[PDB]
């Protein structure tokens, strides 16, 4: 009943414990599970849920054929109970579209879905489950947004959008919403050169977003937002531990204010927690594809262009498929600090597994522990052969 | 806890944004989805839902064979969560029958279902989910009602019924309900010559209904209701932009007080928003069948017999099937105006697609934006070949 | 939050309107619907639900084979939302067993299930969804109860049980429960000679039960209960309109205090409303089997041994299968009188349809109207051929 | 809203009445039922539910192949409504892992799941459905816990864990949790020599746990916990009525302070109620495998090394498969005493039924009656042949 404020710092991250896993593809082999992609996790004050973009068909369904495609009239943002699979019968539609974000401000939830043809897309901003504001495409080239949760502070929920080229300069805007209405927007500033799919978290009245430079950068761009002043900066992770994909091999020195070169015109949504010595980066293990997943403790990664790992944890073996990853936290938990969490999208089917005609995913997520916990690996677990 | 009053005017309609879409036929190819038709949308103060007449069988079920037929003992009014499909497991039965309307008065919901043989039908009026009032057929020829939501003002919810011929003069009545009890009824007056399937909305203490003249009219009849005085008038949309189906080609001058001729004994449920220069009409694109769907801004359409479009938006391409369309609004939303909404029934199967033995539909709906949003088209999306 | 009292009389019954219908067998041909039998309907202060004895298997399931049998370890009393089918996913288990009753006292619900072998059965009485009291078999021969709702008055809910022979004198007891605890019990008194499966309703502080005399009677026995004094009487319906099944042809004079002879050792659960001139009897249309169903207005049927029909309504044609029927009312509805309701079990499969290996049913129910409504017939609607 | 205290003694157990049964394997032959094992039952103040470790696949699913294995990344603790089957659509995930316990303290629920490889497992302790505390493996050999409900007293919920060998001395710890945080832990003391899978209940401010000595004991070890002092003792059931499995034949004298020999390196989770003359033991009927199940009244079993049965009740015939059994009670029921309950896991499939490639189970549970009720037997009820 009052707006949430980011009054706490991050808990110390000494390892990662298992939080949730839906085993959707394993289960959906023989039950009514929706084909998805672009998932995430987001908490309300009373409940945490799984989120994703449905493809408007079950996995066993004949309409799963062609679901490699990102943008259709049959997609929607759905949410469902934590660690359940997204089924026809338990999935709640938040809004219609093929690009989304969502966050609760402490009183109620804002959800945003973009739909339309590539040259004529529009965002609709829902708040308390009703449509409130609409935004038309400004650059007429796939208006698109975070594909993970936004973050609010005292009613103000910033959202990062991009419109324009995926392979050249584009038009990125930071919208500051309150109760679904636009308080303000700004064009992207700072030294980030291309921005897509920001993964965001909040601590001590600052919102940090780790994004995807699709055009040039194999290091990740970072936007930091003041939700009170409604201003931001941008730079890159300085660290030579490179965290996009595909990417070249790790160098010994990164770049703070420019894209690290070697791979153009591609990437993956990812995330980091940037908190001095309490800094952890996620990446795919493979430099070539969305294969494997690990967390690496890289003290001062944001600001230190020679920073290297001092600790890590494998999440998904490099013999298993991964995908998008992103940040969320339970802002309404007990205690004196915010516990960092993330999810990894485990993509199955096309293009890497082309014996099936579909593309889908399941979800695994972890949150930080102050203990030094033993590690397991967490694969999707499905046998593609069963779907043949 | 107090009755809702229609105290607001319509928001300015500059375009239409996507509101909901269930993709029911695509999803029901491989999950337990009920065969429906005659759908709509209706809001409670805390939730908006999809409504339809079930056929008492799933689409993949063997009993889907024969579901082209409108009236059986196996039909029921169901509701289900917004943009979900109507499944066996998530569908809530409101009442039993093969013709319906439903609306919330601010305290609770009235639902009405008609059932029976053609010569002996009866309406039962439910209120707070209990049966309260029953009305026997007065003309012994398919007693029937709106197939979309009614509208309430201070407890009074008017409903339009027709009994008698579909191809000649019939007996239309306006019932004024309060808490499921009949306050008053009136025979149809004014210049409308035949009335079926009224699509209604409320603003500034007046209820406007756009209906179907099955007997003669390719222009649409309009009933306007004073829910305080409990009186009404009727006329036709004056505009030469004709909005029934099938229909002849658009002339340059309409008819205000008589059916526009050229097509007899057929039609489709449709709707309009009639608000001076803020006037928008829906129609099928095809003049021959329930094919395509568009919205047209036709300033003063109700009163101007030469009024032509000044703006439009395509909803469904003329290469895709449509069906019934109707009006609803979220009377419990925030802000200073009521945002116009509509749904379009996307009919699949018989009679236009006769390689399957069933008839069903899915739903798409939009609400107005004050922005000038880019347009997409929104087809059902299912492949009939998959059902073979 | 206070116990309900039977303070109202019955509304005048001038006809019957459709209340609910689940079409379970039609729908369960292609969805996960539980095999049932012995259904009924019962209201809470906020909701009315369908009830039945599950067979612990879906209809399409391989374990549906053998479900003609009444008593197994796999049966349970389930409830589910009104007019929904009893599915695996929406059915709530009230208790485990193969004979049951259930009723809400205004504060919470009592449910009773009997289980065990024929010579060693026991009742467990649940209240507020916890087990409170248990009763062991007294005659060691299929302890059994109403198979429809009980009725409460000021916390006191009487229940009729029988233990002993189905084809000879047996031991019937009336238990008076309050908060799941036994206040009192009595052996059956009066002139009823055999009692099974009582169908009960309450009005003006009296509970009337119409039961089944399996041993000799083709007229129905009647128990009337004073829930304050905790006493009862019994007799038969005097009327020559005979309402058990199988039965001989209607005579011109009935029997008030003895079974009407002609058929031994068989019957069906049925019901009546006995209210002077406002008296209505249900029966199968067939005198030979559970085929068809009609309601007949038989003024003074209880006390007049020459009383004949003055009005009727067909519910199920004699070309369609019926089954058990029983009484319930919504004691928590608005208004000045209790509206009589009933359900009819529509049995499909064995023994009358032996091309399938299962026995199941669906449900239709009606409540009274003060109007003289037109009639329809309400068959199960499924095609057995589809299940082959 | 206040913590529950164990203020009541056990009700007198004169027999056992049926409480719940899900018939999961019968139903899951033709519906979307999760493969499980290691089930139990646990009550909240407003609801009692079924619990189990999912295998992350339906029974009919192709991924059911290999589900004999205990520990995978696809397992999770789920709960679901009492006597329902654990379906994809009604199962709520409590936490991720392959060993668990759960209990409500009167304000909210603590749930604990262990996951990881054998040499590197970790417990995560959830409270109010959020992760609060994590515990790393201390002996690097399958950290594991009760597989049935824990018990709380004034906020303090003790839990028994074991880490180390299954076939030799191991490291057992008693953790005392409050609001998901560790108040204290102790190493196992007393004369119990090996501890696994404790089944616990609470009465008069003492918690009694009956466990599994996998290494040597065919009598069962017993831990008794003071949740105020946060101390414990351990011994064995003195009785010569031996209750593990496999086991040698019953002798005439047991052992109070040492394992009863004859079978090494195997066992089954089981339980007892130890209350002077009101003492009842469960066991499999078979001495060789998890076949059959009975309850035996063995006055002073805990302390009397010659105690023999004075009464019993068969639960599952020795011609039917059983499995794990464990204790729970409804601490929030009415009345002056706690009513003892238990469940039995009915295992189907591998290894005893190897014509199928899966292992799963269903559940039956009973609670005590003060009556001397007639007995039935309660088999799983499924036909394996149907799954072929
Ligand atoms: C039970 O569970 C536990 C808990 O999980 C398990 O214990 C864990 O074990 C894992 C696996 O070993 C550990 O993860 C690795 O962590 C290291 C970081 O720790 C080493 O380095 C630390 C930093 O050392 C510099 O500074 C220090 C001072 O600050 C200085 O002292 C030192 O000399 C040095 O100059 C050391 O502090 C650390 O020592 C503490 O911990 C030790 C245990 O780990 C202990 O033995 C010590 O005594 C001490 O007390 C230790 O030496 C990460 O570096 C590593 O991440 C690299 O390697 C993996 C493959 O294993 C790779 O996937 C990673 O990406 C990463 O390497 C790439 O990136 C580098 C950076 O650019 C690059 O240099 C590398 O060449 C490499 O590059 C190639 O691969 C990448 C990726 O594909 C590609 O992009 C490139 O282009 C290129 O192709 C792992 O994260 C956990 O930290 C550890 N956890 C704990 C709590 O201990 C335990 O094993 C389990 N038990 C069992 C029985 O299974
Ligand atoms: C990005 O998204 C945006 C947003 O959606 C897209 O932009 C939209 O584009 C669509 C498609 O073009 C537009 O819909 C059409 O709108 C016109 C109405 O606008 C024209 O006419 C206006 C009125 O002009 C008279 O009065 C004015 C003064 O008031 C006077 O100035 C004028 O000279 C004239 O005498 C003009 O004001 C308007 O101009 C503004 O907008 C222009 C952009 O549209 C801009 O360029 C201008 O400079 C200006 O600023 C404009 O000229 C509708 O008329 C039209 O509806 C007709 O045609 C479609 C087929 O396209 C048909 O399906 C419709 O039913 C309708 O036509 C039938 O009915 C008529 C009425 O009886 C009849 O006369 C016709 O012959 C026709 O009849 C046949 O078909 C029917 C139906 O099957 C049948 O029943 C008959 O029997 C017969 O067989 C469209 O609705 C949107 O308005 C526009 N939206 C916005 C915000 O701009 C943009 O394209 C997308 N971008 C990309 C790159 O894709
Ligand atoms: C639109 O919908 C409406 C609303 O539903 C439809 O209108 C309804 O139509 C149905 C079907 O006709 C009616 O049901 C029958 O009702 C009669 C009772 O009403 C007749 O008798 C009344 C009593 O008359 C004695 O007393 C009066 C004075 O009190 C005296 O005046 C009279 O001369 C006589 O001596 C009359 O009052 C009544 O007249 C009012 O209504 C008339 C319309 O119905 C109207 O025309 C009149 O002018 C007047 O105003 C009328 O004459 C029931 O008797 C009958 O039930 C018998 O027959 C059916 C087969 O049809 C059978 O299944 C029943 O079981 C029952 O008969 C068996 O039992 C008898 C009792 O033992 C026995 O005598 C019979 O031989 C028979 O026995 C065989 O069958 C049974 C069962 O299988 C077996 O067990 C035996 O062994 C043996 O084999 C029907 O219920 C509705 O009442 C009527 N409703 C309304 C509101 O009007 C309308 O039709 C629909 N419109 C269209 C176009 O479809
Ligand atoms: C209707 O429903 C009701 C309610 O359920 C049914 O009635 C019930 O019927 C069942 C089945 O008969 C009963 O269960 C058995 O109970 C006996 C215990 O009761 C006998 O013993 C009592 C104790 O007697 C010593 O002390 C007393 C004084 O305290 C002294 O007087 C006496 O002489 C003696 O020295 C007697 O008090 C008791 O008498 C009361 O009740 C009688 C009715 O039962 C009545 O007739 C009497 O007049 C009196 O009023 C009675 O004589 C258990 O011992 C027995 O459990 C053994 O046998 C089963 C097989 O049946 C086996 O599975 C069990 O494990 C157990 O036996 C193994 O363990 C023993 C202990 O180590 C060992 O000694 C045995 O050799 C045996 O060992 C082999 O098997 C095991 C297991 O596989 C293996 O591990 C070993 O290695 C080895 O291979 C049953 O539980 C219910 O108690 C009774 N309930 C009630 C309320 O009456 C009624 O039948 C149903 N009606 C119908 C028509 O179906
Ligand atoms: C009660 C009833 O039968 N309504 C049906 C109406 C009437 O036939 C017409 O309005 C003529 O009166 O229209 C439909 O057939 C149609 O056109 O798709 C569907 C609808 O179910
Ligand atoms: C407890 C029990 O078995 N009840 C069964 C009763 C009894 O057999 C009779 O009332 C004779 O006592 O009737 C049925 O068989 C029936 O006629 O369809 C169904 C019901 O399940
Ligand atoms: C954590 C774990 O693996 N628990 C497993 C235990 C252990 O193997 C034993 O208690 C030996 O320690 O027992 C089972 O195998 C069994 O006997 O059915 C099932 C259970 O899943
Ligand atoms: Ca990149
Ligand atoms: Ca027409
Ligand atoms: Ca009889
Ligand atoms: Ca053992």
DSSP C231: E
DSSP C11: P
Tokens coding D51: 């619990």
Tokens coding C171: 């031991």
D311 lines ligand 4 (CB under 6 A): yes
User: Which residues have CB under 6 Å of ligand 3?
Assistant: B 119-120; C 240-241, 249-250, 285, 287, 294, 296, 308-313, 372, 374-375
Any idea which residue has 């010595």 for tokens? A277
Tell me the chain B residues in contact with residue C18 when contact means C-beta distances shorter than 8 Å.
96-97, 113, 115, 124
Q: Residue B175: CB partners within 8 Å, gap ≥ 6?
A: B135, B158, B159, B161, B182, B184, B185
Helix H or strand E encompassing C26:
helix C24-28
The residue count for chain B: 388
Contact A136 B371 (CB under 8 A): yes
Q: Which of C193, C109, C97, C191 is nearest to C137 (CA)?
A: C97
* C63, C116, C136: residue with CB nearest D376: C116
Q: How far is B285 from chain A (nearest CA, A)?
A: 20
Count of Cβ atoms closer than 10 Å to residue D265 Cβ: 11
As a whole number of angstroms, the longest Cα–Cα distance in chain D is 55
Tokens coding A268: 């993956």
C165 lines ligand 6 (CB under 6 A): no
Question: Chain B, 50-109: which have a CB under 8 Å from a chain C CB?
Answer: 56-58, 60-63, 72-74, 76, 88-89, 91-93, 96-97
Q: Which of C364, C366, C376, C377 to mutate to test the interface with B (most CBs of B within 10 A)?
A: C376
Any idea which residue has 């199962």 for tokens? D91
Domain covering C1-388, topology: Neuraminidase (2.120.10)
What are the structural domain ranges in chain D? 1-388
Q: Residue C8: CB partners within 8 Å, gap ≥ 6?
A: C203, C204, C336, C337, C338
Q: Residue D38: CB partners within 8 Å, gap ≥ 6?
A: D52, D53, D99, D100, D147, D269, D324, D345
Helix H or strand E encompassing C28:
helix C24-28
Task: Give residue D99's Cα distance to chain centre.
Answer: 11
Tell me the chain D residues in contact with residue C115 when contact means C-beta distances shorter than 8 Å.
18, 376
Contact B117 C376 (CB under 8 A): yes
Q: Which residues pair with B328 in a beta bridge?
A: B341
In Å, how far are D236, D247, D298 from D242, measured between CA atoms? Answer: 11, 7, 11
Q: Which of D56, D58, D71 to mutate to test the interface with A (most CBs of A within 10 A)?
A: D56
Any idea which residue has 């300033």 for tokens? B299
Contact D72 A381 (CB under 8 A): yes
Q: Which ligand is nearest to the CA of A263?
A: 8
* A73, A74, A88: residue with CB nearest B31: A88
Give the residue numbers of C marked as catalytic. Answer: 70, 324
Please confirm whether the linkage preceding A201 is cis (ω < 30° from 0).
Answer: no
Tokens coding A114: 């973009």
In Å, how far are A38, D35, D239, D240 from D253, measured between CA atoms? Answer: 65, 41, 7, 5
- b (16+ CB within 10 A) / e for C327-345: bbbbbebeeeebbbbbbbb
With beta carbons less than 8 A apart as the criterion, state whether A363 and A67 touch: no
Cα–Cα distance, C191 to B263 (Å, whole number): 72
Q: Strand pairing of A9-10 and A337-338?
A: parallel
SS (H, E, C) chain A: CCCCCCCCEECCCCEEEEEEECCHHHHHCCCCEEEEEEEEEEECCCCEEEEEEEEEEECCCHHHCCCCCCCCCCCEEEEEECCCCCECCCCEEEEECCEEEEEECCCCEEEEEEECCCCCCEEEEEECCEEEEEEECCCCCCCECCCCCCCCECCEEEEEEEEECCCCCEEEEEEEEECCEEEEEEECCCCCCCCEEEEEEEECCEEEEEEECCCCCCCCEEEEEECCCCEEEEEECCCCCCCCCCCCCCCCCCCCCCCCCCCCCCCCCCCEECCCCCCEEEECCCCCCCEEEEEEECCCCCCCCCCCCCEEEEEEEEEEECCCEEEECCCCCCCCEECCEEEEEEEEECCCCCCCCCEEEEEEEEEEECCCCCCCCCCCCCCHHHHC
Q: Which of A20, C139, B32 is nearest to D113 (CA)?
A: A20
Q: Where are the alpha helices (DSSP H) in chain D?
A: 24-28
Is A49 flagged in the annotation as binding?
Answer: no
The CA D264 to ligand 11 mean position distance, Å, reads: 6
Q: Residue C291: CB partners within 8 Å, gap ≥ 6?
A: C284, C285, C318, C319, C320, C321, C322
Cα–Cα distance, D49 to D47 (Å, whole number): 7
Ligand 6 atom nearest residue C267's Cα: 17
The answer to whether A49 contacts chain D (CB < 8 Å) is no
Cα–Cα distance, C54 to C39 (Å, whole number): 9
Tokens coding B366: 């939009």
Cα dihedral A69, A72, A77, A80 in deg (nearest 10): -60
Beta strands in C193-336 (DSSP E): 196-203, 206-212, 221-226, 231-236, 272-273, 280-283, 291-297, 311-321, 325-328
User: Which residues have CB under 6 Å of ligand 7?
Assistant: D 38, 70-71, 99, 142, 144, 166, 196-197, 214
Count of Cβ atoms closer than 10 Å to residue A319 Cβ: 10
With beta carbons less than 8 A apart as the criterion, state whether D359 and D375 touch: no
Task: Give residue D188's Cα distance to chain centre.
Answer: 19
Cα–Cα distance, C274 to B170 (Å, whole number): 42
**Where does residue A293 fall: left (phi above 0), alpha (psi -120 to 50 degrees), or beta otherwise?**
beta
Alpha-carbon dihedral sign for residues B65, B68, B72, B76: positive
Tell me the chain A residues in contact with residue B23 when contact means C-beta distances shorter than 8 Å.
56-57, 74, 76
Tokens coding B72: 């059986």
In Å, how far are A369, C23, C31, C319, D316 from B63, measured between CA atoms? Answer: 55, 11, 12, 20, 41
Given D32, D44, D70, D258, the catalytic residue: D70
Q: Which of C34, C65, C74 to mutate to test the interface with D (most CBs of D within 10 A)?
A: C74
Cα–Cα distance, A200 to A161 (Å, whole number): 13
Contact A26 D74 (CB under 8 A): yes
* Minimum CA distance residue for ligand 5 atom 19: B70
DSSP D33: B
Given B236, B260, B293, B324, the catalytic residue: B324
Tokens coding D3: 């913590």
Tokens coding B45: 């103060």
Cα–Cα distance, D216 to D212 (Å, whole number): 10
Please confirm whether the linkage preceding B226 is cis (ω < 30° from 0).
Answer: no
Q: Which residues pair with C208 in a beta bridge?
A: C201, C224
With beta carbons less than 8 A apart as the criterion, state whether A5 and A206 touch: no
Q: What is the DSSP string of D312-327?
A: EEEEEEEEEE---EEE
**Cross-sheet strand order for the sheet of D48-58:** D34-43, D48-58, D76-81, D92-96
Tell me the chain B residues in contact with residue A134 when contact means C-beta distances shorter than 8 Å.
17, 369-371, 373
Cα–Cα distance, B339 to A95 (Å, whole number): 17
In Å, how far are C374, D174, D295, D320 from D325, measured between CA atoms? Answer: 59, 21, 11, 15
Cα–Cα distance, B35 to C26 (Å, whole number): 12
Q: Which of B37, B116, B35 is nearest to B72 (CA)?
A: B116
**Cross-sheet strand order for the sheet of A130-136:** A99-104, A109-115, A122-127, A130-136
With beta carbons less than 8 A apart as the criterion, state whether B94 and B36 touch: no
In Å, how far are A139, B104, B329, C308, D110 from B81, measured between CA atoms? Answer: 35, 16, 16, 50, 32
Alpha-carbon dihedral sign for residues A308, A188, A124, A106: positive
With beta carbons less than 8 A apart as the criterion, state whether A201 and A210 touch: no
The answer to whether C315 contacts chain B (CB < 8 Å) is no
By the 10 Å C-beta count (0-12 exposed, 13-18 middle, 19+ buried), A288 is classed as exposed
Q: What is the DSSP string of D132-176?
A: EEEEE-SSSS--B--SS----BTTEEEEEEEEE-SSS-EEEEEEE
* D330, D373, D383: residue with CB nearest C134: D373
Q: What is the DSSP string of D194-224?
A: --EEEEEEEETTEEEEEEE--SS-SSPEEEE
With beta carbons less than 8 A apart as the criterion, state whether D43 and C130 touch: no
Count of Cβ atoms closer than 10 Å to residue C199 Cβ: 29
Q: Which of A127, A126, A129, A123 is nearest to A97 (CA)?
A: A123
Triad C283, C287, C289: Cα angle to 5°: 90
Q: Which of A176, A122, A159 is nearest to B371 (CA)?
A: A122
Q: Resolution of this entry in Å?
A: 2.2
Please confirm whether the linkage preceding A246 is cis (ω < 30° from 0).
Answer: yes
Contact A56 B27 (CB under 8 A): yes
* Minimum CA distance residue for ligand 3 atom 67: C309
Ligand 5 atom nearest residue B323's Cα: 18
Q: Which of B297, B293, B383 is nearest to B344 (CA)?
A: B293
Any idea which residue has 């009703």 for tokens? A130
Ligand 5 atom nearest residue B114's Cα: 1
Look up A2 and say whether it is catalytic: no
Cα–Cα distance, B170 to B181 (Å, whole number): 24
Q: Residue B18: CB partners within 8 Å, gap ≥ 6?
A: A96, A97, A113, A115, A124, B364, B366, B376, B378
Beta strands in D240-333 (DSSP E): 272-273, 280-283, 291-297, 311-321, 325-328
Cα–Cα distance, D21 to B275 (Å, whole number): 61
Cα–Cα distance, C94 to C113 (Å, whole number): 8
User: Which residues have CB under 6 Å of ligand 2?
Assistant: A 119-120; B 240-241, 249-250, 285, 287, 294, 296, 308-313, 372, 374-375
Tokens coding C101: 């009753």
With beta carbons less than 8 A apart as the criterion, state whether B102 and B38 touch: no
Cα–Cα distance, A328 to A39 (Å, whole number): 12
The answer to whether B118 contacts chain C (CB < 8 Å) is no
Tokens coding C293: 């169903």
Q: Which of D67, D59, D169, D161 is nearest to D113 (CA)?
A: D161
Cα–Cα distance, D301 to D165 (Å, whole number): 28
The answer to whether B12 contacts chain A (CB < 8 Å) is no
Given A51, A201, A324, A343, the catalytic residue: A324
Is D71 flagged in the annotation as binding?
Answer: yes
The answer to whether B20 contacts chain A (CB < 8 Å) is yes
Q: Which of D282, D258, D256 is nearest to D271 (CA)?
A: D282
Helix H or strand E encompassing C288:
none
Is C197 flagged in the annotation as binding?
Answer: yes
The answer to whether C204 contacts chain D (CB < 8 Å) is no
Cα–Cα distance, B128 to B126 (Å, whole number): 7
Residue of C113, C144, C347 to mutate, ligand 6, most atoms within 8 A of C-beta = C144
Q: Which residues pair with C50 in a beta bridge?
A: C41, C80
Q: Which of C116, C33, C136, C46 is nearest to C75 (CA)?
A: C116
Cα–Cα distance, B141 to B163 (Å, whole number): 6
Q: Strand pairing of C9-10 and C337-338?
A: parallel
In Å, how far are B99, C194, C296, D61, D375 from B52, measured between CA atoms? Answer: 10, 48, 34, 33, 50
With beta carbons less than 8 A apart as the criterion, state whether D169 and D146 touch: no
Look up B250 and say whether it is catalytic: no
Cα–Cα distance, D134 to A9 (Å, whole number): 20
Tell me the chain B residues in contact with residue A36 when contact means C-beta distances shorter than 8 Å.
none
Helix H or strand E encompassing D89:
none
SS (H, E, C) chain B: CCCCCCCCEECCCCEEEEEEECCHHHHHCCCCEEEEEEEEEEECCCCEEEEEEEEEEECCCHHHCCCCCCCCCCCEEEEEECCCCCECCCCEEEEECCEEEEEECCCCEEEEEEECCCCCCEEEEEECCEEEEEEECCCCCCCECCCCCCCCECCEEEEEEEEECCCCCEEEEEEEEECCEEEEEEECCCCCCCCEEEEEEEECCEEEEEEECCCCCCCCEEEEEECCCCEEEEEECCCCCCCCCCCCCCCCCCCCCCCCCCCCCCCCCCCEECCCCCCEEEECCCCCCCEEEEEEECCCCCCCCCCCCCEEEEEEEEEEECCCEEEECCCCCCCCEECCEEEEEEEEECCCCCCCCCEEEEEEEEEEECCCCCCCCCCCCCCHHHHC
């Amino acid at each position: 009943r009052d707006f949430n404020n980011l009054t706490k710092g991050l808990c110390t991250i000494n390892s990662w414990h298992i939080y949730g896993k839906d085993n959707a593809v394993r289960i959906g082999e023989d039950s009514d599970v929706l084909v998805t992609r672009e998932p995430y996790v987001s908490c309300d004050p009373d409940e945490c849920r799984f989120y994703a973009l449905s493809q408007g068909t079950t996995i066993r369904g004949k309409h799963s054929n062609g679901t490699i495609h990102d943008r259709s009239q049959y997609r929607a943002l759905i949410s469902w109970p934590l660690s359940s699979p997204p089924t026809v019968y338990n999935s709640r539609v938040e809004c219609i579209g093929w690009s989304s974000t969502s966050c609760h401000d402490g009183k109620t939830r804002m959800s945003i879905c973009i739909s339309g043809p590539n040259n004529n897309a529009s965002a609709v901003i829902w708040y308390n489950r009703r449509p409130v504001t609409e935004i038309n495409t400004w650059a007429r080239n796939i208006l698109r947004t975070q594909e993970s949760e936004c973050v609010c502070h005292n009613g103000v929920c910033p959202v990062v959008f991009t419109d324009g080229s995926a392979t050249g300069p584009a038009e990125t805007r930071i919208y500051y919403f309150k109760e679904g209405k636009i308080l303000k927007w700004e064009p992207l500033a700072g030294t980030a050169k291309h921005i897509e799919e920001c993964s965001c978290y909040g601590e001590r009245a600052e919102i940090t977003c780790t994004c995807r430079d699709n055009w040039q950068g194999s290091n990740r761009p970072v936007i930091r937002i003041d939700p009170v002043a409604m201003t931001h900066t941008s730079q890159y992770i300085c660290s030579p531990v490179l965290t996009d994909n595909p990417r070249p091999n790790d160098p010994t020195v990164g770049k703070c204010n420019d894209p690290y070169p070697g791979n153009n015109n591609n990437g993956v949504k990812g995330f980091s927690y940037l908190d001095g010595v309490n800094t952890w980066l996620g990446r795919t293990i493979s430099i070539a594809s969305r294969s494997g997943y690990e967390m690496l403790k890289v003290p001062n990664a944001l600001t230190d262009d020679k920073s290297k790992p001092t600790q890590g944890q494998t999440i998904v073996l490099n013999t298993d498929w991964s995908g998008y990853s992103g940040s969320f936290m339970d802002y309404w938990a007990e205690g004196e600090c915010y516990r960092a969490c993330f999810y990894v999208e485990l993509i199955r089917g096309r293009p890497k597994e082309d014996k099936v005609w579909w593309t889908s995913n399941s979800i695994v997520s972890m949150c930080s522990s102050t203990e030094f916990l033993g590690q397991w690996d967490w694969p999707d677990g499905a046998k593609i052969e069963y779907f043949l």
